[PDB]
Design a protein around this motif. Structure first.
Motif, mmCIF file in Angstrom:
data_model
loop_
_atom_site.group_PDB
_atom_site.id
_atom_site.type_symbol
_atom_site.label_atom_id
_atom_site.label_comp_id
_atom_site.label_asym_id
_atom_site.label_seq_id
_atom_site.Cartn_x
_atom_site.Cartn_y
_atom_site.Cartn_z
ATOM 1 N N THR A 139 81.410 -47.539 0.731
ATOM 2 C CA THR A 139 82.755 -47.488 0.188
ATOM 3 C C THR A 139 83.671 -46.597 1.012
ATOM 4 O OG1 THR A 139 81.860 -46.088 -1.629
ATOM 5 C CG2 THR A 139 82.346 -48.395 -2.078
ATOM 6 N N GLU A 140 83.147 -45.574 1.643
ATOM 7 C CA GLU A 140 83.998 -44.797 2.516
ATOM 8 C C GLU A 140 84.386 -45.661 3.688
ATOM 9 O OE1 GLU A 140 82.485 -41.360 4.758
ATOM 10 O OE2 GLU A 140 84.183 -40.377 3.952
ATOM 11 N N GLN A 141 83.407 -46.335 4.258
ATOM 12 C CA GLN A 141 83.699 -47.149 5.408
ATOM 13 C C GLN A 141 84.670 -48.256 5.050
ATOM 14 O OE1 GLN A 141 79.749 -48.128 6.763
ATOM 15 N NE2 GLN A 141 79.890 -46.533 8.339
ATOM 16 N N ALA A 142 84.548 -48.813 3.844
ATOM 17 C CA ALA A 142 85.484 -49.844 3.429
ATOM 18 C C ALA A 142 86.881 -49.258 3.375
ATOM 19 C CB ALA A 142 85.117 -50.401 2.056
ATOM 20 N N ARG A 143 86.989 -48.073 2.785
ATOM 21 C CA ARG A 143 88.252 -47.381 2.624
ATOM 22 C C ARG A 143 88.888 -47.119 3.977
ATOM 23 N NH1 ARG A 143 86.372 -43.260 0.234
ATOM 24 N NH2 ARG A 143 86.390 -44.149 -1.847
ATOM 25 N N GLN A 144 88.049 -46.793 4.948
ATOM 26 C CA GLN A 144 88.469 -46.480 6.299
ATOM 27 C C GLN A 144 88.752 -47.703 7.164
ATOM 28 O OE1 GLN A 144 85.105 -44.134 7.550
ATOM 29 N NE2 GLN A 144 86.059 -42.197 6.897
ATOM 30 N N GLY A 145 88.508 -48.912 6.653
ATOM 31 C CA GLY A 145 88.763 -50.123 7.432
ATOM 32 C C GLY A 145 87.699 -50.437 8.483
ATOM 33 N N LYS A 146 86.515 -49.858 8.337
ATOM 34 C CA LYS A 146 85.442 -50.058 9.302
ATOM 35 C C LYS A 146 84.607 -51.283 9.023
ATOM 36 C CE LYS A 146 84.974 -45.263 10.505
ATOM 37 N NZ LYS A 146 84.222 -44.026 10.216
ATOM 38 N N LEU A 147 84.821 -51.892 7.876
ATOM 39 C CA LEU A 147 84.058 -53.059 7.497
ATOM 40 C C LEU A 147 84.957 -54.280 7.557
ATOM 41 C CD1 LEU A 147 82.202 -51.468 4.522
ATOM 42 C CD2 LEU A 147 81.545 -51.541 6.922
ATOM 43 N N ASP A 148 84.409 -55.394 7.986
ATOM 44 C CA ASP A 148 85.163 -56.631 8.046
ATOM 45 C C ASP A 148 85.591 -57.056 6.659
ATOM 46 O OD1 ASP A 148 84.877 -56.598 10.596
ATOM 47 O OD2 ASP A 148 83.351 -58.057 10.778
ATOM 48 N N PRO A 149 86.784 -57.608 6.468
ATOM 49 C CA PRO A 149 87.209 -58.107 5.195
ATOM 50 C C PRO A 149 86.337 -59.288 4.901
ATOM 51 C CG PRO A 149 88.698 -58.821 6.943
ATOM 52 C CD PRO A 149 87.705 -57.851 7.570
ATOM 53 N N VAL A 150 85.936 -59.463 3.656
ATOM 54 C CA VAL A 150 85.114 -60.626 3.340
ATOM 55 C C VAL A 150 85.890 -61.874 3.028
ATOM 56 C CG1 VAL A 150 83.360 -61.637 1.816
ATOM 57 C CG2 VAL A 150 83.172 -59.349 2.707
ATOM 58 N N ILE A 151 85.472 -62.960 3.654
ATOM 59 C CA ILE A 151 86.079 -64.248 3.442
ATOM 60 C C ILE A 151 85.233 -65.169 2.593
ATOM 61 C CG2 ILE A 151 86.839 -66.353 4.478
ATOM 62 C CD1 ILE A 151 86.715 -63.150 6.426
ATOM 63 N N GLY A 152 85.825 -65.662 1.522
ATOM 64 C CA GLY A 152 85.127 -66.584 0.659
ATOM 65 C C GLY A 152 83.955 -65.927 -0.022
ATOM 66 N N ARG A 153 82.933 -66.718 -0.282
ATOM 67 C CA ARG A 153 81.773 -66.249 -1.010
ATOM 68 C C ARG A 153 82.132 -65.654 -2.350
ATOM 69 N NH1 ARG A 153 77.932 -67.223 1.406
ATOM 70 N NH2 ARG A 153 77.307 -66.990 3.504
ATOM 71 N N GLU A 154 83.058 -66.303 -3.032
ATOM 72 C CA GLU A 154 83.464 -65.795 -4.312
ATOM 73 C C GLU A 154 82.339 -65.890 -5.322
ATOM 74 O OE1 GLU A 154 86.101 -64.150 -5.080
ATOM 75 O OE2 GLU A 154 85.881 -64.038 -7.204
ATOM 76 N N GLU A 155 81.591 -66.978 -5.337
ATOM 77 C CA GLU A 155 80.578 -66.991 -6.372
ATOM 78 C C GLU A 155 79.499 -65.961 -6.060
ATOM 79 O OE1 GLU A 155 80.946 -68.419 -9.170
ATOM 80 O OE2 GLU A 155 79.207 -67.581 -10.072
ATOM 81 N N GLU A 156 79.123 -65.812 -4.788
ATOM 82 C CA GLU A 156 78.084 -64.841 -4.501
ATOM 83 C C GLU A 156 78.532 -63.430 -4.859
ATOM 84 O OE1 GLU A 156 78.841 -67.223 -2.200
ATOM 85 O OE2 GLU A 156 77.082 -68.177 -1.435
ATOM 86 N N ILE A 157 79.788 -63.082 -4.589
ATOM 87 C CA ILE A 157 80.171 -61.737 -4.951
ATOM 88 C C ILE A 157 80.227 -61.606 -6.467
ATOM 89 C CG2 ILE A 157 82.664 -61.964 -4.914
ATOM 90 C CD1 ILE A 157 80.619 -59.024 -3.630
ATOM 91 N N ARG A 158 80.631 -62.662 -7.176
ATOM 92 C CA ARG A 158 80.656 -62.553 -8.621
ATOM 93 C C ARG A 158 79.252 -62.421 -9.166
ATOM 94 N NH1 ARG A 158 84.478 -67.377 -10.916
ATOM 95 N NH2 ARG A 158 86.472 -66.767 -9.991
ATOM 96 N N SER A 159 78.309 -63.131 -8.562
ATOM 97 C CA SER A 159 76.932 -63.109 -9.008
ATOM 98 C C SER A 159 76.357 -61.731 -8.802
ATOM 99 C CB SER A 159 76.140 -64.108 -8.217
ATOM 100 O OG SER A 159 76.618 -65.390 -8.458
ATOM 101 N N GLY A 176 81.504 -56.736 1.042
ATOM 102 C CA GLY A 176 82.390 -57.251 0.024
ATOM 103 C C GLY A 176 82.278 -56.425 -1.223
ATOM 104 N N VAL A 177 81.078 -55.984 -1.553
ATOM 105 C CA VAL A 177 80.923 -55.179 -2.737
ATOM 106 C C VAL A 177 81.716 -53.917 -2.545
ATOM 107 C CG1 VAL A 177 79.382 -53.812 -4.112
ATOM 108 C CG2 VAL A 177 78.618 -56.027 -3.255
ATOM 109 N N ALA A 178 81.581 -53.312 -1.377
ATOM 110 C CA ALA A 178 82.308 -52.084 -1.132
ATOM 111 C C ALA A 178 83.811 -52.307 -1.238
ATOM 112 C CB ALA A 178 81.955 -51.534 0.236
ATOM 113 N N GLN A 179 84.291 -53.427 -0.721
ATOM 114 C CA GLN A 179 85.715 -53.726 -0.758
ATOM 115 C C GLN A 179 86.198 -53.951 -2.177
ATOM 116 O OE1 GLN A 179 86.252 -57.014 2.035
ATOM 117 N NE2 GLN A 179 84.948 -55.769 3.386
ATOM 118 N N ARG A 180 85.399 -54.637 -2.974
ATOM 119 C CA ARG A 180 85.792 -54.891 -4.342
ATOM 120 C C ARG A 180 85.909 -53.556 -5.042
ATOM 121 N NH1 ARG A 180 86.173 -58.845 -2.220
ATOM 122 N NH2 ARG A 180 88.345 -58.293 -2.690
#
Ligand SMILES: Nc1ncnc2c1ncn2[C@@H]1O[C@H](COP(=O)(O)OP(=O)(O)OP(O)(O)=S)[C@@H](O)[C@H]1O
Ligand SMILES: Nc1ncnc2c1ncn2[C@@H]1O[C@H](COP(=O)(O)OP(=O)(O)OP(O)(O)=S)[C@@H](O)[C@H]1O
Ligand SMILES: Nc1ncnc2c1ncn2[C@@H]1O[C@H](COP(=O)(O)OP(=O)(O)OP(O)(O)=S)[C@@H](O)[C@H]1O
Lengths: 579, 189, 63
Positions: free
Chosen positions: A11-31, A60-64
């Protein structure tokens, strides 16, 4: 704190922009979220082929979490990635490393937001076959506390956890699907600005599209997310490299070119400047193979379709070359490899005549697990896997047992020839040439040079009476070679004599030859025998010219620049004499 | 969904696996753990009916043909296998009627698979080339597959050459020039 | 430490002339270099026959 030493704050890395934004995979992230939101055993594990993007889901979890798309239940949360180091930083002093691990768990449950721990490479949790595994995540998982999320492949999962048992109970398997090309392109677009920044280049939208589709066609061993990204990034890098080497944009052709550099498939080089060589492939092949123009054209056409991109992605070129021995069926195929690679040895020659029923498939595909020898692949996996653009040659296919030909049916349609271990080869990019003598009984009808009608039909008859229809149906073209007429023989003689000079590694083996009409005529008449095709010419040259040369050399009657003289037969000139 | 391309080439040991698959598909792996695939779809293929369907006597399988084909199937596989298959279907032969519809489909398929269709098919087939492909490609005893060969031989090879020569910039002109007509695609630019 | 104990500084060996010069292989060198220039997964691997010059390629990289 142990987390500050042994884990990465995703989550720090997400906050810092070090992780790629996640594209799609909406059901997997919801699951993933629904499982983490559970009260008991809230421990999902992302399962799927490597190259799928399951790590991206974790990102994606970190971004959410950073943007609170996470349900109330999980909003007050942090995500850490546990390094193996918690245990692999050293076990010196038995139990210490387990204690560090437990230490981490204490920190995770203790109050400070819903800390969720990510376990990469979850196979490591297996420990030394249970035993040393201790309580890796035991009471944790058993109470819905110390929630973890993990990720691993099917191949790994199949052993590790299935062997452990306990982890299956504790973890909740979630499959992560490979994206479609459509989805793949969307991923590339989402990451486009990352790559543009990474390399200082613009990416053409068409280029993004191209990589995704192209990757599906030419990178069968690597899942689309990765494969498409490999092509985009390598292309971008290529532009950046060019910038430093001394245009700051990636286009579809940048990609195609680079893909060829990585895949070996020449089609994607888009060598428009070399179309003249391809266009005249017929001409070039005819400089070695005399006559047999229909065969030559059949090949040229197959190659041209491949190079144009028009050849069906799932249809290897497939030919049956029929004719009398000495008709150039093998020679043509070799010459084609010559033309295509500037190297006849590129070819994967398969002595398909050496294929009796019980062995043939293990010589081509190799055996399954268990049986002696696991270099699975025999000839074909072991060669096709590395040279997808290659030419396969099956000499005398009529002798191959029908059982192996049955296997060839896969190869010949969709390229789905699989290894003994179950891996798919995907050789649809190759050219397959097979040869036989089945038509000899009708070519021996002597019905013309260009094989006449009826004779060709009788040959087709022999073929149909030999191979199963399903085999024949998968052949792109059945080609019958022509009888080598006197005129063909004259042309052949010119060529064979040239080869003799090409075999002359040293300048003491060299002809001026002379008799370019007399010897040519002599040889042409003597080699004009339907019963051996062009082949007796090799014998004529050896018996009338080379054997004698060998003796002249032994006797030092030649230093260089040899001459053939006419005998009422042929012989050689004595230049020096026993010098 | 599983596909067994020529399940008929299987030896009894595999057929036994399939017997389980097709009825209580709790297939035991070599590992010793079962699979339980009752929720899958199993499609298997065989060439056994070739001996009767090649009589060409009716494109829709006739009752005599049907029984002869099933005879071969029952001779080849034990009935125990056959009795576990939801249905056994003998595919109908490709009547010329079908061939005309198929040619259109195939031509569109070619367009659909043509990556980045700068060059794209206009498919000015006209009824004449439609008939050409449909008629001359109707090698009834080999199904629709020969249609593909015909297209590759007559259309795509020429197209590829015109592409290599850059005689075509985009699109794709089609016409019939006059089986000896060989269709023959026109120039472009 | 570490790297200085368990590894050879190929670069310095090249500087010292202890490695063979590498002849040609520009396309393979460019491909290797291009991969190294990638941002993500910049990890090329040289795959081929037993002895064709994979060491030579890496030495070429050092040079
Ligand atoms: N759907 C996606 N959204 C954003 N980035 C993605 C996506 N899919 C792939 N990527 C990128 O490409 C990579 C996907 O591969 P990863 O999931 O990291 O590898 P993997 O699927 O874990 O395979 P392993 O087992 O970790 S080698 C990520 O590192 C992202 O950079
Ligand atoms: N049309 C041709 N033009 C030039 N050389 C030819 C031609 N046909 C055959 N040859 C010679 O034939 C020799 C090789 O034999 P092949 O003709 O390939 O026998 P093949 O029948 O092709 O292969 P098989 O089926 O095992 S004999 C070479 O030395 C070629 O030079
Ligand atoms: N292009 C080249 N320039 C200079 N030397 C080369 C070149 N290609 C090969 N070599 C020689 O290859 C030898 C070392 O071979 P390697 O590259 O190690 O063989 P290899 O490809 O590593 O095979 P392995 O994997 O070590 S059995 C050196 O002694 C080089 O002289």
């Amino acid at each position: 704190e142990y987390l500050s030493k042994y884990a990465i704050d995703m989550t720090e890395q997400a906050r810092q922009g070090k992780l790629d934004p996640v594209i799609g995979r909406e059901e997997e992230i919801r699951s993933t979220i629904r499982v983490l939101a559970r009260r008991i055993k809230s421990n999902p594990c992302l399962i799927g082929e490597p190259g799928i993007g399951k790590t991206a889901i974790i990102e994606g979890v970190a971004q959410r979490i950073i943007d609170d798309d996470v349900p109330t239940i999980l909003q007050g949360a942090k995500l850490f990635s546990l390094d193996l180091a918690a245990l692999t930083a050293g076990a010196k002093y038995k139990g210490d490393f387990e204690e560090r691990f437990k230490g981490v768990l204490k920190e995770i449950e203790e109050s400070k937001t819903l800390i969720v721990l990510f376990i990469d490479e979850i196979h490591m949790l297996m420990g030394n076959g249970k035993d040393d595994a201790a309580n890796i995540l035991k009471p944790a998982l058993s109470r819905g506390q110390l929630k973890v999320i993990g990720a691993t492949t099917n191949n790994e999962y199949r052993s590790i956890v299935e062997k452990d048992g306990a982890f299956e109970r504790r973890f909740q398997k979630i499959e992560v699907a490979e994206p479609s090309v459509r989805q793949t392109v969307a991923i590339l677009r989402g990451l486009q600005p990352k790559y543009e920044i990474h390399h200082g280049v613009r990416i053409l939208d068409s280029a993004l599209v191209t990589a995704a589709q192209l990757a599906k066609r030419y990178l069968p061993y690597r899942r689309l997310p990765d494969s498409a990204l490999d092509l985009v990034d390598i292309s971008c890098a290529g532009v950046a490299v060019a910038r430093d080497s001394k245009q700051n944009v990636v286009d579809s052709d940048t990609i195609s070119e680079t893909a060829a550099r990585l895949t070996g498939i020449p089609v994607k080089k888009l060598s428009e400047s070399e179309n003249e060589k391809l266009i005249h492939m017929e001409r070039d092949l005819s400089s070695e193979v005399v006559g047999q123009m229909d065969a030559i054209k059949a090949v040229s056409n197959a190659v041209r379709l491949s190079r144009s991109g028009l050849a069906n992605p799932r249809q290897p070129a497939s030919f049956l070359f029929l004719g009398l021995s000495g008709s150039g069926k093998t020679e043509l195929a070799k010459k084609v490899a010559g033309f295509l690679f500037n190297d006849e040895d590129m070819m994967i020659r398969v002595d398909c005549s050496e294929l009796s029923e019980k062995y043939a498939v293990s010589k081509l595909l190799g055996t399954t697990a268990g049986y002696v020898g696991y270099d699975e692949g025999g000839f074909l996996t072991n060669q096709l896997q590395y040279k997808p653009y290659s030419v396969l040659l099956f000499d005398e296919v009529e002798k191959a047992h029908p059982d192996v030909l049955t296997v060839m049916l896969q190869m010949l349609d969709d390229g789905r020839i699989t290894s003994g271990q179950g891996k798919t080869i995907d050789c649809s990019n190759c050219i397959v040439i097979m040869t036989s003598n089945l038509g000899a009984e009708f070519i021996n009808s002597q019905q013309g040079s260009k094989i006449q009608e009826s004779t060709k039909n009788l040959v087709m008859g022999a073929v149909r009476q030999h191979f199963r229809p399903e085999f024949l149906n998968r052949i792109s073209s059945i080609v019958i070679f022509n009888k080598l007429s006197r005129k063909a023989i004259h042309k052949i003689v010119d060529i064979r004599l040239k080869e003799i000079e090409e075999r002359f590694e040293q300048n003491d083996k060299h002809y001026k030859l002379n008799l370019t009409q007399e010897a040519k005529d002599f040889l042409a008449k003597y080699g004009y025998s339907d019963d051996m095709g062009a082949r007796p010419l090799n014998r004529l040259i050896q018996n009338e010219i080379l054997n004698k040369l060998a003796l002249r050399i032994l006797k030092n009657e030649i230093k260089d620049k040899e001459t053939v003289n006419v005998v009422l037969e042929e012989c050689l000139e004595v230049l020096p004499n026993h010098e």
